[PDB]
Design an enzyme around this catalytic site. Structure first.
Site, short mmCIF file in Angstrom:
data_model
loop_
_atom_site.label_atom_id
_atom_site.label_comp_id
_atom_site.label_asym_id
_atom_site.label_seq_id
_atom_site.Cartn_x
_atom_site.Cartn_y
_atom_site.Cartn_z
N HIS A 122 0.78 -1.26 0.00
CA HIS A 122 0.00 0.00 0.00
C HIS A 122 0.79 1.28 0.00
O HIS A 122 0.24 2.33 0.33
CB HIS A 122 -1.02 0.06 1.14
CG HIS A 122 -1.72 -1.24 1.39
ND1 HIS A 122 -2.50 -1.85 0.43
CD2 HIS A 122 -1.73 -2.05 2.46
CE1 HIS A 122 -2.97 -2.99 0.91
NE2 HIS A 122 -2.53 -3.13 2.15
N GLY A 123 2.07 1.22 -0.36
CA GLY A 123 2.88 2.42 -0.47
C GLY A 123 2.85 3.32 0.76
O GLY A 123 2.84 2.87 1.90
N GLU A 124 2.77 4.62 0.52
CA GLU A 124 2.74 5.56 1.62
C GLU A 124 1.34 5.68 2.24
O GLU A 124 1.19 6.43 3.19
CB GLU A 124 3.26 6.92 1.16
CG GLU A 124 4.66 6.90 0.57
CD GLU A 124 5.08 8.26 0.00
OE1 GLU A 124 6.26 8.61 0.11
OE2 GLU A 124 4.23 8.98 -0.57
N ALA A 128 -0.16 3.30 3.92
CA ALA A 128 -0.25 2.39 5.06
C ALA A 128 0.06 3.17 6.33
O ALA A 128 0.67 4.22 6.27
CB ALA A 128 0.72 1.20 4.88
N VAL A 136 5.25 2.08 7.31
CA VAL A 136 5.83 1.73 6.02
C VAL A 136 7.19 1.12 6.21
O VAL A 136 7.98 1.62 6.98
CB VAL A 136 5.97 3.00 5.17
CG1 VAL A 136 6.53 2.64 3.79
CG2 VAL A 136 4.62 3.67 4.98
N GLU A 169 17.38 -6.81 10.00
CA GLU A 169 17.99 -7.56 8.90
C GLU A 169 17.02 -7.59 7.77
O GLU A 169 15.84 -7.94 7.95
CB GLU A 169 18.34 -8.99 9.31
CG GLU A 169 19.43 -9.09 10.40
CD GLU A 169 19.53 -10.47 11.05
OE1 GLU A 169 20.67 -10.86 11.43
OE2 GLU A 169 18.53 -11.22 11.16
N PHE A 170 17.51 -7.26 6.58
CA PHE A 170 16.68 -7.31 5.37
C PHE A 170 16.51 -8.72 4.86
O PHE A 170 17.48 -9.46 4.61
CB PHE A 170 17.26 -6.47 4.22
CG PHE A 170 16.35 -6.37 3.03
CD1 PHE A 170 15.19 -5.64 3.09
CD2 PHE A 170 16.69 -6.96 1.83
CE1 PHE A 170 14.33 -5.53 1.98
CE2 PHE A 170 15.88 -6.81 0.71
CZ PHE A 170 14.69 -6.11 0.78
N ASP A 222 -0.09 -10.21 16.37
CA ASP A 222 -0.70 -10.57 15.06
C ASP A 222 0.27 -11.35 14.19
O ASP A 222 0.84 -10.84 13.26
CB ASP A 222 -1.24 -9.38 14.29
CG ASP A 222 -2.33 -9.76 13.30
OD1 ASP A 222 -2.41 -10.94 12.91
OD2 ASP A 222 -3.07 -8.85 12.91
N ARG A 273 3.94 -11.82 8.27
CA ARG A 273 5.08 -11.79 9.24
C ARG A 273 6.17 -12.78 8.96
O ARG A 273 7.21 -12.73 9.58
CB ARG A 273 4.61 -12.13 10.66
CG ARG A 273 3.51 -11.25 11.16
CD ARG A 273 3.95 -9.82 11.38
NE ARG A 273 3.01 -9.12 12.26
CZ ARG A 273 3.07 -7.83 12.54
NH1 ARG A 273 3.98 -7.06 11.97
NH2 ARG A 273 2.17 -7.27 13.36
N1 LIG Z 1 12.96 -7.65 7.86
C1 LIG Z 1 12.29 -7.46 6.73
N2 LIG Z 1 12.93 -7.57 5.54
C2 LIG Z 1 12.26 -7.32 4.39
N3 LIG Z 1 10.98 -6.95 4.36
C3 LIG Z 1 10.32 -6.84 5.54
C4 LIG Z 1 10.95 -7.07 6.72
N4 LIG Z 1 10.07 -6.83 7.71
C5 LIG Z 1 8.91 -6.52 7.15
N5 LIG Z 1 9.06 -6.51 5.80
C6 LIG Z 1 8.02 -6.20 4.82
O1 LIG Z 1 7.14 -5.21 5.27
C7 LIG Z 1 5.83 -5.77 5.41
C8 LIG Z 1 5.15 -4.98 6.56
O2 LIG Z 1 5.87 -5.22 7.76
P1 LIG Z 1 5.26 -4.52 9.04
O3 LIG Z 1 4.85 -3.08 8.83
O4 LIG Z 1 6.24 -4.73 10.15
O5 LIG Z 1 4.07 -5.42 9.45
P2 LIG Z 1 2.46 -5.28 9.02
O6 LIG Z 1 1.95 -6.66 8.50
O7 LIG Z 1 2.21 -4.07 8.14
N6 LIG Z 1 1.77 -5.17 10.47
P3 LIG Z 1 2.02 -3.93 11.52
O8 LIG Z 1 2.98 -4.39 12.59
O9 LIG Z 1 0.61 -3.63 12.06
O10 LIG Z 1 2.61 -2.75 10.72
C9 LIG Z 1 6.07 -7.28 5.53
O11 LIG Z 1 4.81 -7.94 5.22
C10 LIG Z 1 7.18 -7.45 4.50
O12 LIG Z 1 6.58 -7.34 3.19
#
Ligand SMILES: Nc1ncnc2c1ncn2[C@@H]1O[C@H](COP(=O)(O)OP(=O)(O)NP(=O)(O)O)[C@@H](O)[C@H]1O
Ligand SMILES: [Mg+2]
Length: 297
Positions: free
Chosen positions: A34-36, A38, A41, A102-103, A150, A155
């Site tokens: 959802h880009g910016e 959400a 981000v 960590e990515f 969640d 996740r």
């Molecule tokens: N360590 C990571 N490395 C690469 N991508 C990640 C990593 N962590 C999260 N992401 C990406 O970012 C998305 C959103 O992560 P995040 O914002 O932490 O959780 P969310 O499902 O949006 N729930 P919330 O904790 O409510 O924000 C994940 O579904 C991945 O697509």
């Protein structure tokens, strides 16, 4: 060659460092959905030493007191385990509230299970996911982080070797005062919507929903799945894309585990140690590397 060696100790990053690493939060670097639009981000970044990072950017309003934010981030930052995308740091300068992990370069369970490009996810990989995530939860609990806010397919992340890991970001809430589940209520534990309080037993119910996702290849409401299992209508439940990869017996055994996780009464659900124990003997195709199993390198 950073994914070789340990994550290194939790540290505070400067906002200049993180801006430089993400090209000032360039929309091109957004990796979350959802880009910016959400409420928070996640950006891909690269540090000057070439290490790749994931940067979770919150609105100040989510975590307005930087002292509270840092305290939480530091506690999560003590956890170091190969089943986790570990938390490297945080940044709280210039009104920013950032978590640095960590990515993980091979996207999410959601992507490879629901939105696959080459091929549907192999049964053996689904099982490897369930084990790795169970081992992650057991680790987190062992370090005094038994809450996970969640647990769902978004996740679950895939690392440089295409091994599944659990996101560290869900060890913290999306805001200080917010809800631990922000997603569809039909998927949340029964007691959650009563109390609005996440407990360790909640996470296990959510693990159950992960199992259902893996079993069915779609995001099935647990009441619908539980009706199907009650009525012994397994062929309606199981992913038709799994045909011939699994025994009725090992499929049966995973559904049994889901049923325990999804028990109405929280005290009846297994703990993380027991999830690990149940998943270990179900593993298949140990010899196939994850990159080969997933269809990546
Ligand atoms: N360590 C990571 N490395 C690469 N991508 C990640 C990593 N962590 C999260 N992401 C990406 O970012 C998305 C959103 O992560 P995040 O914002 O932490 O959780 P969310 O499902 O949006 N729930 P919330 O904790 O409510 O924000 C994940 O579904 C991945 O697509
Ligand atoms: Mg988010």
């Amino acid at each position: 060659h950073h994914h070789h060696h340990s994550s290194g100790q939790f540290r505070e990053f400067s906002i200049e460092t993180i801006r430089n690493a993400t090209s000032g939060f360039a929309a091109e670097n957004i990796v979350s959905e959802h880009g910016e639009r959400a409420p928070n981000v996640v950006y891909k970044g690269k540090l000057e030493n070439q290490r790749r990072i994931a940067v979770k950017r919150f609105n100040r309003k989510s975590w307005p007191d930087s002292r509270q934010f840092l305290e939480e981030a530091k506690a999560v930052g003590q956890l170091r385990n190969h089943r986790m995308a570990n938390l490297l740091g945080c940044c709280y300068e210039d009104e920013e509230r950032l978590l640095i992990a960590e990515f993980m370069p091979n996207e999410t369970l959601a992507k490879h299970l629901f939105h696959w490009e080459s091929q549907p996810m192999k049964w053996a990989m689904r099982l490897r996911v369930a084990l790795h995530i169970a081992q992650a939860l057991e680790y987190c609990t062992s370090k005094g982080r038994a809450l996970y806010h969640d647990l769902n397919a978004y996740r679950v992340l895939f690392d440089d070797d295409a091994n599944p890991r659990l996101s560290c970001f869900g060890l913290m809430k999306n805001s200080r005062d917010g809800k631990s589940y922000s997603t569809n209520l039909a998927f949340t534990p029964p007691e959650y919507l009563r109390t609005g309080r996440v407990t360790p037993e909640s996470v296990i119910y959510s693990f159950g929903t992960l199992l259902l996702d893996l079993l069915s290849g779609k995001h099935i409401p647990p009441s619908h799945a539980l009706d199907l299992i009650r009525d012994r209508n397994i062929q309606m439940l199981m992913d038709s894309g799994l045909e011939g990869q699994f025994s009725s017996d090992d499929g049966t055994e995973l559904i049994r585990l889901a049923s325990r996780c999804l028990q109405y009464e929280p005290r009846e659900r297994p703990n993380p140690k027991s999830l690990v124990s149940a998943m270990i003997p179900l593993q298949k195709d140990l010899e196939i590397a994850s990159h080969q199993l997933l269809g990546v390198p």
